[PDB]
Amino acid sequence: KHEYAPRFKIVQKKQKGRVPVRTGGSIKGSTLQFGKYGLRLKSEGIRISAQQLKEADNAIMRYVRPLNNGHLWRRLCTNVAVCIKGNETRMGKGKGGFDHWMVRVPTGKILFEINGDDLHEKVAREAFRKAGTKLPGVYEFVSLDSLVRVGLHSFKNPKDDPVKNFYDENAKKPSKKYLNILKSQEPQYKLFRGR
Amino acid sequence: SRTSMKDSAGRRLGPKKYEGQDVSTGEIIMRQRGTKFYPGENVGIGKDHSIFALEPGVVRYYLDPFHPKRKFIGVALRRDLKLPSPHFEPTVRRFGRFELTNKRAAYKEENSI
RNA sequence: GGCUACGUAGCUCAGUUGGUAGAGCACAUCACUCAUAAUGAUGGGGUCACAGGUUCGAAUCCCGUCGUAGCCACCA
RNA sequence: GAAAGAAUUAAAUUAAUAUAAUGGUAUAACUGUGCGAUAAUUGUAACACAAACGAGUGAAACAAGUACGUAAGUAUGGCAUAAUGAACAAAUAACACUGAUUGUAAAGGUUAUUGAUAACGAAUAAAAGUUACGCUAGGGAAGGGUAAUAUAGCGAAAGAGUAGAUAUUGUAAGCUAUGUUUGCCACCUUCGACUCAACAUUUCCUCUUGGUUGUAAAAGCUAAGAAGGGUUUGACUGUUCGUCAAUUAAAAUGUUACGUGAGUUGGGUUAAAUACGAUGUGAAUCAGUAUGGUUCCUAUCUGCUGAAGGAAA
RNA sequence: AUAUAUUUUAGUAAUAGAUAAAAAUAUGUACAGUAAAAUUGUAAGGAAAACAAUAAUAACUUUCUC
RNA sequence: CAAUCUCUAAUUGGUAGUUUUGAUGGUCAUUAUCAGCAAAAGUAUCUGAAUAAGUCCAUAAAUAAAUAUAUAAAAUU
RNA sequence: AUAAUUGAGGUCCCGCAUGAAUGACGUAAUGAUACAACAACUGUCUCCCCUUUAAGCUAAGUGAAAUUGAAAUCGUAGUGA
RNA sequence: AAUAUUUAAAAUCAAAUAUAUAUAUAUUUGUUAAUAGAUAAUAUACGGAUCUUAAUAAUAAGAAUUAUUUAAUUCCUUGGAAUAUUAUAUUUUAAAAUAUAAAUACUGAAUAUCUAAAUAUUAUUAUUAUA
RNA sequence: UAGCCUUUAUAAAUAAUAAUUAUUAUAUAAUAUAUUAUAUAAAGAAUGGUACAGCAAUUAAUAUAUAUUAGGGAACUAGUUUUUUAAUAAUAUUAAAUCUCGAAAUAUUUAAUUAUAUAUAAUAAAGAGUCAGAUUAUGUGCGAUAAGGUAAAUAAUCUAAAGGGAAACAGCCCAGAUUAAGAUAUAAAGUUCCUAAUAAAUAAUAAGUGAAAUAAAUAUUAAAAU
Ligand SMILES: [Mg+2]
Ligand SMILES: [Mg+2]
Ligand SMILES: [Mg+2]
Ligand SMILES: [Mg+2]
Ligand SMILES: [Mg+2]
Ligand SMILES: [Mg+2]
Ligand SMILES: [Mg+2]
Ligand SMILES: [Mg+2]
Ligand SMILES: [Mg+2]
Ligand SMILES: [Mg+2]
Ligand SMILES: [Mg+2]
Ligand SMILES: [Mg+2]
Ligand SMILES: [Mg+2]
Ligand SMILES: [Mg+2]
Ligand SMILES: [Mg+2]
Ligand SMILES: [Mg+2]
Ligand SMILES: [Mg+2]
Ligand SMILES: [Mg+2]
Ligand SMILES: [Mg+2]
Ligand SMILES: [Mg+2]
Ligand SMILES: [Mg+2]
Ligand SMILES: [Mg+2]
Ligand SMILES: [Mg+2]
Ligand SMILES: [Mg+2]
Ligand SMILES: [Mg+2]
Ligand SMILES: [Mg+2]
Ligand SMILES: [Mg+2]
Ligand SMILES: [Mg+2]
Ligand SMILES: [Mg+2]
Ligand SMILES: [Mg+2]
Ligand SMILES: [Mg+2]
Ligand SMILES: [Mg+2]
Ligand SMILES: [Mg+2]
Ligand SMILES: [Mg+2]
Ligand SMILES: [Mg+2]
Ligand SMILES: [Mg+2]
Ligand SMILES: [Mg+2]
Ligand SMILES: [Mg+2]
Ligand SMILES: [Mg+2]
Ligand SMILES: [Mg+2]
Ligand SMILES: [Mg+2]
Ligand SMILES: [Mg+2]
Ligand SMILES: [Mg+2]
Ligand SMILES: [Mg+2]
Ligand SMILES: [Mg+2]
Ligand SMILES: [Mg+2]
Ligand SMILES: [Mg+2]
Ligand SMILES: [Mg+2]
Ligand SMILES: [Mg+2]
Ligand SMILES: [Mg+2]
Ligand SMILES: [Mg+2]
Ligand SMILES: [Mg+2]
Ligand SMILES: [Mg+2]
């Protein structure tokens, strides 16, 4: 509903920033969560405007609405407010006025997701290709068995990466603050703190 | 047009004296906005929460179990002392005065009340 | 920072050189006219500008600052 | 087993903080309450932080006095970081320091206090415009870059096309090229006409060819090859352009310092004169209108057009 | 029971608790305490007036008791 | 009266000497807070600010609260 | 009006932003003023051609000028204050 | 063969290094190409020539592009050893055997060294005449 | 005026610059469950909140044949169910200049030790010049993730630096000219010729692709792996 037009109460101008190249191997929003088939970015990290996203959504919908129990999950919201000065105006003299909403999209991230009752995968693939024709990146069809993109030419299965109880790890190799707290909890300090 | 071209300078609010550093009485160990560091052993605190040394010694940053979730800056009277000092041991104190070996000076001091 | 002189009724204005709550004025009802209205008579509200003293007796004198613009000073 | 107390643990600083925002604050800096109303005191302040100077900030300690607290102690205004202004010249007090012959005085000094210089390190107590009649010293304290726009193309194809997205058409969004427009940058300080044109091809005509339920024929439409040859004369306007008239096989689009003023012109743009409308108190002014109105050059080199001499044939 | 005299009371006014997030003295000091939101309710009361209630007691001290 | 000399006041582009900030098409110039600021500190531009400041708060809730009531004392009665 | 007129004249009046001695309006005459039309004329032009004289050119004599860091001073593309 | 993905060393396998060590653990490395798309104005414009190899047939050429490498090739632990190569000499019948060598790729600065000269300073000397 | 530069000097002078040690844990050995030594591992005394990472709280975004709160319809005789409309909850998934509960490296930075002394700091007395900067790389603000643009941050070079390379070249890659000499090591860059110097190995390309200034989506044709 509000993914292409956030309702920040205090509307305000924003700096340009940069699209996060996720050097640490994030895989956040790079996985199929809601649907069966999806459309992910394949190229270098890119900014997608609100209008472009809307058009992609519309393109996808043409295939989704005919389906029985058809659904489209829009995975990303255009949260960054972009202002622009005109091409007509000189440089300097303040910042330009609000123009459009935009989203910073890392390399591996999923944009859309679909799942119908009577949805064959070929149709879904076609729809997602047609959606990609309207967006500024280069995109890729992603199924539930197809594995998570991280880099431009690199891949990963989330099933592989290890599970860890971090409290236990902390206890094993404790910080100074934690040790101080533990000492405080002990009786030769707790009795004589005198509050 | 109307531009937002106005800002105060930076308040120089780092630590002004570091761990293991020799100090003198009066010297500022920390400038800060509110007690990020609390005044520890042999150390005072000012109006602007500025930690300053009460005695000559060695600046030490530490945690104390009595005050968990609070960082401290204190001044150890020597380099030998671990400055979160043992609680039930006697306080390491500085006399900090000198006897008036000079006779006249001693006499003057005796006279003065 | 000091010094003035003015601020009655909803409107306009008296009154002022002390022993007064007065006047038309626009406003609502009767009156008169064929039927309007001009004209004739009904009444209307004032802490006599916030607020204290001297004469049994001051709206008027004296006397605190509200207020309105002045005036002086200081203006390096 | 029960009651009461002491409390501890968890959570919380999201409330509250005189006031912005940030940091801090429950051990509370927040809140309530007694006393008080004192420390919103007086002389010396080292040493640090910050820092060009001028200033600014934290502050141990020594001495005088005060308030609260059983005491320990705490208080030199406010949880902190804004809340401000130099000298000079005046003004008011206190000080007992100087007292221009001596004594008084005046006047100056010390100490405390006063009002502003917001263009806010404050030039004076006190200062706005105009010039196309202008002058001097200097500085540059279309080309180049860019490609948002513009022009052209490509991919995908919603949708028109009597039916069929792709004969022809092709929304909004996607990917490029160009440096032909309008911009942006600031390295770098004249429009049109005439004359002669050279180059490009993104081809307007002519030649070859693919597609065209939308190629029966004929006219077309669209696309590929193709730059050999060719591609206008008049009325209006300074105009390029545009409107129209009459033609043409066609009347293509650019580049060349938007080719070409040491080749011509000077209608536009342009200074001195003048008037009009508007603006201004005015001098005068204008992304205004109108009449008038100033540059010249024998060619040294390059280059090109012709013509000789010398030469190694 | 009634008369006079001399007095006394009635000026009728909130805090009764070291009060603790209604409002009020914004700097000192001493002592003490904890806010807010949300939720469940309740006369007018309704989304929005007020009041109530809403985390855990192991160990410790004292008291009574099987 | 008026004229002249000396003093004093009103008026003046009549006339003379000067001036017309730095940054911009009325707005910004001093101070504080955060971001920009890249985990010390500092850090700019006609950068973004729900930006904020030229302050505000004091002489006050007092007085009374132990020798007392007739008579007699004054070792506290 | 012209084959065709952003010019000229006539007329209309949302006069962006006319107006009465900063005069208003309509005429006769005048004007090397400015704009437009008709006639006549023409080398202005279609479209240039021929001729004449003075230069230009050559020989003799006399003899400048601006300019000039030094020059043994080609094209193209690239580069580069 | 057919259909549909992916173009990957994360997982997986293989190979190598390091810790106890015939194994385990940890680390490191290994996963497409071509063409079209393609484009303006003085003149082709990798700096230019030019570069993709070919038997017969050479004492002889065969990227001068892209990617990963080496300094002849293979094991052992920069070094040695073996292997063939190449060149040469000797001996024997243009070949065979023996042995010697080459294997340190090279170019390259006004860098460094060496080689000499100068000045200045520091520290030692020698000779000659604040010695 | 300070910053940076120069000259002359001063010491009860190393205060300067660089690194190490400093910590945590494990195993082994020796003393009294602790201490010391040895070895190994760990981005390893103190200070920090950027990258990264994350969705906690704040600010934002999405989904539920899930639950609650009411509303709009709807079927039988006001009660009830369903298809729902918003809010709240629950669960799952997401991001931000002014969010950071996790969190680097670089950084700031302290003592002693070692190494630099033909070297540094500090102080004293004196002289300046400079206050138009440029480019390259990285991280940003503005611009349009445009500019040989603009604004600052860090480093280097140019400025003021000749020499080799990058065709030519202020700022790029090497390297700092006291004067020569030219044997030896070389740097960056090169070794068919122009032009100083070359031979190999294994793959791939056939397009002159390319050969020192890499042009995109997309299309076609192959090639591997599943
Ligand atoms: Mg992120
Ligand atoms: Mg700040
Ligand atoms: Mg406060
Ligand atoms: Mg706060
Ligand atoms: Mg400092
Ligand atoms: Mg100073
Ligand atoms: Mg306080
Ligand atoms: Mg003055
Ligand atoms: Mg005298
Ligand atoms: Mg000024
Ligand atoms: Mg100033
Ligand atoms: Mg000034
Ligand atoms: Mg002035
Ligand atoms: Mg004029
Ligand atoms: Mg250009
Ligand atoms: Mg159709
Ligand atoms: Mg379109
Ligand atoms: Mg036909
Ligand atoms: Mg063509
Ligand atoms: Mg021909
Ligand atoms: Mg004509
Ligand atoms: Mg031109
Ligand atoms: Mg010319
Ligand atoms: Mg010329
Ligand atoms: Mg004339
Ligand atoms: Mg004048
Ligand atoms: Mg911060
Ligand atoms: Mg910062
Ligand atoms: Mg930093
Ligand atoms: Mg910082
Ligand atoms: Mg006409
Ligand atoms: Mg004409
Ligand atoms: Mg007039
Ligand atoms: Mg006239
Ligand atoms: Mg005349
Ligand atoms: Mg002659
Ligand atoms: Mg040059
Ligand atoms: Mg691996
Ligand atoms: Mg070319
Ligand atoms: Mg080359
Ligand atoms: Mg040398
Ligand atoms: Mg100086
Ligand atoms: Mg040292
Ligand atoms: Mg930040
Ligand atoms: Mg944290
Ligand atoms: Mg400057
Ligand atoms: Mg620049
Ligand atoms: Mg210079
Ligand atoms: Mg150089
Ligand atoms: Mg240098
Ligand atoms: Mg040198
Ligand atoms: Mg080529
Ligand atoms: Mg090239």
Say how far apart CA A47 and CA A26 lie, in whole Å: 18
In the block, which residue shows the tokens 């042999």? B42
Does A24 lie at the interface with B, CB-CB under 8 angstroms? no
CA nearest to B87, candidates A188, A190, A182? A188
Inter-chain CB proximity B66 and A193 less than 8 Å:
yes
Query: Which candidate from A93, A177, A188 shows the least CB-CB separation from B63?
Result: A177
- Counting Cα atoms < 13 Å in the Cβ hemisphere of A101 gives 16
- Which residues, listed in sequence order, are joined to residue B76 by a DSSP beta bridge? B58
- What is the CA A27 to C1' G32 distance in angstroms? 94
- What is the three-class DSSP state of A41? strand
Query: Which candidate from B3, B65, B87 shows the least CB-CB separation from A184?
Result: B65
Structural method: cryo-EM
Say how far apart CA A80 and CA A21 lie, in whole Å: 17
Residue B31: both structure tokens together: 């400038």
Output the CA A39–ligand 8 centroid distance in Å.
Answer: 77
- Counting Cα atoms < 13 Å in the Cβ hemisphere of A17 gives 18
Cβ neighbours of residue B84 closer than 8 Å, sequence gap 6 or more: B62, B63, B64, B65, B72
User: Å resolution of this model?
Assistant: 3.2
Is the CB of residue A22 less than 8 Å from the CB of residue A104? Answer: no
Does B78 lie at the interface with A, CB-CB under 8 angstroms? no
Mutate to test the interface with A, among B63, B69, B85 (most CBs of A within 10 A): B63
Say how far apart CA B105 and CA B111 lie, in whole Å: 10
User: Angle at the Cα of A193 (from A188 to A194), degrees rounded to 5?
Assistant: 130
Return left, alpha or beta for B60; rule: phi > 0 is left, psi -120 to 50 is alpha, else beta: beta
- What is the CA B42 to C1' F57 distance in angstroms? 36
Say how far apart CA A104 and CA A20 lie, in whole Å: 7
Amino acid identity, position A79: N
Residue A176: both structure tokens together: 């100074």
Cβ neighbours of residue B86 closer than 8 Å, sequence gap 6 or more: none
Is the CB of residue A84 less than 8 Å from the CB of residue A101? Answer: no
Say how far apart CA A159 and CA A128 lie, in whole Å: 26
In the block, which residue shows the tokens 């960054």? A80
CA nearest to A63, candidates A129, A137, A2? A129
CA nearest to A3, candidates A65, A79, A61, A63? A79
How far CA A50 is from CA of A57, A77, A79, A87, A141, in Å, comes to: 11, 8, 9, 21, 21
Say how far apart CA B24 and CA B56 lie, in whole Å: 4
Question: CB contacts < 8 Å between A and B, how many?
Answer: 27
Breaks in chain A (C–N > 2.5 Å) following residue:
none
Those nucleotides of strand I lying less than 7 Å from any protein Cβ are: 22, 24, 45-48, 51-55, 59-64, 92-98, 103, 108-111, 139-147, 149-150, 217-218
Say how far apart CA B16 and CA B29 lie, in whole Å: 5
Q: What is the DSSP letter of A162?
A: P
Chain A, 165 to 184: residues with Cβ < 8 Å from chain B are: 176-177, 180-181, 183-184
- What is the three-class DSSP state of B16? coil
How far CA A9 is from CA of A12, A15, A100, A101, in Å, comes to: 9, 18, 17, 15
Say how far apart CA B67 and CA A194 lie, in whole Å: 11
- Counting Cα atoms < 13 Å in the Cβ hemisphere of A69 gives 6
- Counting Cα atoms < 13 Å in the Cβ hemisphere of B44 gives 13
Task: For A36-82, give the secondary structure using H, E and C.
Answer: CEEEEECCCCEEEEHHHHHHHHHHHHHHHCCCCCCCECCCCCCCEEE
All residues of chain A having their beta carbon less than 8 Å from the beta carbon of residue B69 are 177, 181
Cβ neighbours of residue B19 closer than 8 Å, sequence gap 6 or more: B59, B60, B61
Is the CB of residue A122 less than 8 Å from the CB of residue A13? Answer: no
Mutate to test the interface with A, among B5, B66, B87 (most CBs of A within 10 A): B66
